[model samples]
Target: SIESTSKSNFQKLSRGNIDVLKGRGSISSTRQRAIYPYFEAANADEQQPLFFYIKKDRFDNHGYDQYFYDNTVGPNGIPTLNTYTGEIPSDSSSLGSTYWKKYNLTNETSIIRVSNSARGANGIKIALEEVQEGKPVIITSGNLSGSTTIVARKEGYIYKVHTGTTKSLAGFTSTTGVKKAVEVLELLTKEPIPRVEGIMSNDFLVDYLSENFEDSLITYSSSEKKPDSQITIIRDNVSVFPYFLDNIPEHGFGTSATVLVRVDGNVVVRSLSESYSLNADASEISVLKVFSKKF
Candidate 1:
C-alpha cells in the first residue's frame, strides 16, 4: 500500500516600459516609433557592431505604429509580408530578459606601403657570434678565458660587466656580444630567500580541562539521582551489612534541571528530562554469544 499528498502555489511579477528617441516629434508620434536600443558610428576604415532591443508591443499596436507603417508599406501602396514589421515580444520574465541583437558594418579596404630613407644601405645591422673570438664584446665570466668579476649597473638585468686583468678575447664577436654579457651577469647575481618565525602557546590547558569535566559530571549525576522520600529496607540475619540508597516513587519522580552561571553576573538554567513516563513491560532485551561454535 502507498499514500501521497500534493500542494500548489502561485506568484505575480511585472516589468517597466522604456521609450526611445527617433526624430524630434510629439509623444504620441514618437512613442509609436521604435528605435535601436543602442547604436555606434563605424570608423572610415573599420566596422561597427549593430545594436538592437526587442519591441515590447506589436508594431501596429499602441506604441509601435511608426515601425509597422514604414516597414510594412510596399511600392504600390500595398502591404507586403517581406517587410519585418511584426514585433517580437520582450522576454521580461525569462533568464535572458535584456537580450540584444547585433550586426556589423565594415568600411572599404585599402593598402599603403611604408618607405625608409636609409638609401640603399641597410637601415639596421644584426649580427650573431659565439664567445670563442675577440671583438670587444660582452662575455660571461664563465664563458670568458680569464679570471673576471661581474658588476651590475642597473636594476634587474639592465647592465653588467666582467672585471679581469688579462682579457682572453678569443671567442669575442659583434653579434653574440650582448647575450654573452647577460649570461655572465645572471650567474653572478641571483635572488635569495628571506627568514621568518612563528609563535604560539596552549598554557590554559589545566583550566580548560577542569571546567569541561565539571560540567559533564554535574549533568550526568543530575540525570541519575532520585528523590529522598521512597526508600524501603528490610533487616535480616543473613546479611549484617547496613546500606541505604535514596529512591523515588513510581510516577512521582521529577526531571533533572540545570543552572548556568556567567562571569558578568548572568545566570541561565535548562531542564533535560522528558515530560512522559516509560513503559517497563514494553521494554525487551536480547543477547547472543558464540565462542568455538564455528558454522
Candidate 2:
C-alpha cells in the first residue's frame, strides 16, 4: 500500500503569478525563469538534490551567488525568498571562524528528501555553512538607495532595487538597505567606504588657522573648504609651504616635522625626524652633529 504524495499543491501557482500577485521578487528574467521548470520534471516520488557551489573570478554571478549570512531587516524591510533574517549567532561553542545560524531561509528550500531519510543517518541534519570574505561585484543591479541590503546572492533570488518599504525604489533615501549593505560588505571585506561629508565652513577654517597656527594675516581667499588652498603660511616674512596633517604621532618631548620646499617649481620634502634626537637634557654635548642651510 502507498500513501500518495503531493508536490503540485505549492507548484500550482506560476512563478510570475506569485511575483506579481504576492510580491514574490524583483526582475531578472534571464536568471529567474529556470526555477519552476526544474521542478516540473519530478516524478511523484522523485527527489532531486543540488549542492551549493562558489567559483570565484567567474563570469556568471551564479558561481559567486552562494551563501548569505546574518542579514538584518528593518521595521518595514522584507527580505527576499532565499535569504535568512537576523544577526550572526554566537561562537562560544563553535570552531575557529564559525557561528551558529540565527535564522533560516524563509523560502526556496526544497521539501524533496528521501522518504526514509533520517537526521545523522542518511546525512547530517544541518547544511554546511559557506561564506567568503568578498567585495561588492555589481553586475546588473547597478541601482542604490538610502539603505542597502547587502545579502550575498544565494541560489536564484535577487535584490537589485531598494524595497525597504512596501513600495520599491531605485533612488537613495536618508537611510537605505543598499547603504547598510555597503557598510556591512565593507566591514566584511576589511575595507572602508570613502567618506564624502563633514566639510568645514569658511568661518570655521579661518578660525582654526588663526587659533592653532597663530596667524592674523589671511592671505588667500576661495570658496573651497580645504585649508591648504585657502590659508597662507610664512615664517620670518618668507612664504613657507604648509599643508594639513590629519594626525601626527609623538614619540618624545621634542618636535619632529617635515617641510616641503620648491626647487625650480618642483617640490622637495625635508624630514627632521631622521636627523634629530633628544634625551634627558638634550643631545650629548660631546656628540657633534652638523647641519647645512639645505640638506
Candidate 3:
C-alpha cells in the first residue's frame, strides 16, 4: 500500500505541481506551453518533411507568436493565425492543440516577394522559373546572392522552400515590368512572410531507430561473475550469456526482469524484479536474456 506521503508526492510530481524535482511531467509542463509553428505537406498524413519559419527580426530576437498565418479566415482573404492565448488549454483548440495550427489551404501560396537589386531580382527570377515548372532550385551562398543561398523544391506540384528561402510556395514572386519584371511583391500586401530556417520533426530519428535497431538486445547484468550463481537465458534453442550478476541478489537470484534497449545499442537496467526465488534451477534459462527483441 502506498503511504499518504508517497501518494501525494507521486500525484504532485505527475501533475507538475512541484518545482524542485524535475521529471518528465515537470519538463513538459513548461515545454508544452510555447506554441511553435510548423508546415506539413498536404499530401502526407504523417507529420514528416516538416518546415519551420521565422521572421528575420524574430529570428534574431527569438519571438514565437503571430508569425503563423493561414489562407482564409476573413472576407479580405487575409492570412490570420490563431494568436496564442495563455488562458486556453493545450488540447482545448479545435485543431487539437492550440500550439499547432495546420495550414492546409496554402497550396499555390506565395508568402514572400524578394525584389531588390537586379541581382536579387534575377536570383528570384531563376528560382521562380525552376520551382514553377515542377522542379527544384538550390542556390549556393556566396558574395553575389547575399550571405545565404536559396534551395526550393516542388512537392506534388506544390512549391515548398527548403532552406534560405520562403516558408511556403505562396511566396517569392516578381512584381515589376517585363524587362526587369522580377520585382518585390510585398508592396501589394504587407504580410510579413518568414524565411524557411529548417525543420523540426521526429520522422528521421524514428525511421532510423525503426530500421537499424529493430530486434536489438538490452538487459541488465551484474558484477558477480560466478557461473554457479548465474542463470541461463535460452532463445530459439540457443543459450544466452549473462553480462553481470552483482545486482542479481538485490533483484533476486532467480527472476524475470525487463529492460529497454536504446537505438544507440545501450541497455537500460533498473533494480526491478518480476518474480524471485532462492533456489537456482537449470531450467531457469528464462530467468535472464539480454533483453532480446523487445523493440
Candidate 4:
C-alpha cells in the first residue's frame, strides 16, 4: 500500500531514488549511502530533549534510508511534518505515516562506537549496536579517567572534577603519584551496572537533572489551558495532565484520546492519558504519575 514500495511508484523522487538510497556502492560491494536529519530548534533557553532514531529501512529497499518529523507543536498548534509521508502506514517506525528512520544496518553485528559524549553540556553518551531487531545493547565495562570540573559518569565510576588545585587519577598506580597525575578527576562508584551484551548504556535525563536542577521542584504548563478547545496540558512534581481542546464523536485525540505525561521526580518517564472526554465538558484530572512510593 505504501507508494515507496509500490511497483508503479518506482524511482519517482530523485535520480538516486529519494525513497531510500538503492543500488550499487559506486564500484564497491556491500553498500554506502548518506543522509542524516539535522535537528535545529528555535531557542536555547529551554532544554528540549531531542532523540534521533537511526536505522536502515528493511520493509522496502530505500537503500537503508531513515527520516523523522518532530511532534513538538509550534506556535500555531501544528506539527511541521511532511504531509505526503504522513500518509504511510503506522508501525514502530511509522508515526501516522511519516517514518522515523536511521540508516538501516546491512548486518546485525555491524560495529558502532560512541565517540566521547563527555562534553560539558552533559548527558551520558553510549555506544550501541542495533542488534536484536533494531534495539540497543549498551556496552557496560570500561575504566575511563580524565580531567574535569563538575562530574563525569563512566561505565563503572563517577569522576568528580572539582575546581582549584588538584591531582590526577589514572588506574590505581600507587595511589599518591596517580592522584597527582594528568587525570585529576576522582573515580568512585558504589553501584555497579549489570553486565550486558554491549560496552555502555544510555544515561537518563534525571542524571543531568540532579547535576543542576537538584532540590528544584518546578511546574511547567504548555500548549492550551486545563480546558481549552484543543490540546491543553499542565504539569507538577511527578505528573502531567493533557487533554483536548474540544470534544469528539469517535476515535482518538479529541474524545478519550491518550496523551503523554513526562514525570520529573526521582524518576523520569512518560505517563499516559488524563482528562479526555467525548462530552467536551468533562474536567480532566488524569495526571502522569510515574512512581508513587512514599510514606
Q: What TM-score would each prediction reach against the true structure?
A: 0.11, 0.17, 0.17, 0.15
Error of 3 at 221 (Å): 39
Query: What does candidate 3's lDDT look like per residue over 1-295, in tens digits?
Result: 2244334433332232322111101000001121222222111001134322223221112232332322233343221112121221122112111121211101111112111122121122121221222111111111111111111222211111111112221112111111111011111112234221232211221222233221212111223332222223323321222333455434232211121112123322111121122234311222232222121
Highest lDDT among the candidates is held by which one?
Answer: 3
The whole-model C-alpha lDDT of candidate 3 against the native structure comes to 0.20
Candidate RMSDs in order = 41.4, 29.4, 24.5, 22.0
Task: List clashing residue pairs in candidate 1.
Answer: 127-175, 129-176, 131-171, 132-170, 132-171, 133-170, 133-171, 133-172, 134-172
Write the candidate numbers in order of decreasing lDDT.
Answer: 3, 2, 4, 1
Query: lDDT (0-100) at residue 18 of candidate 4?
Result: 26
Off by over 4 Å in 3: 1-52, 55-67, 74-85, 90-205, 208-295
By the TM-score metric, which is better: model 3 or model 4?
3
Worst 10 residues of 2 by lDDT: 115-124
- What local distance difference test score does each model get? 0.16, 0.19, 0.20, 0.19
Writing each residue's lDDT as its tens digit, candidate 2 over 19-45 gives 111111111111211111111000010
Write candidate 1's Cα lDDT for 109-143 as tens digits: 00000010001000000111111111111111111
Shift of residue 251 alpha carbon in model 2, Å: 63
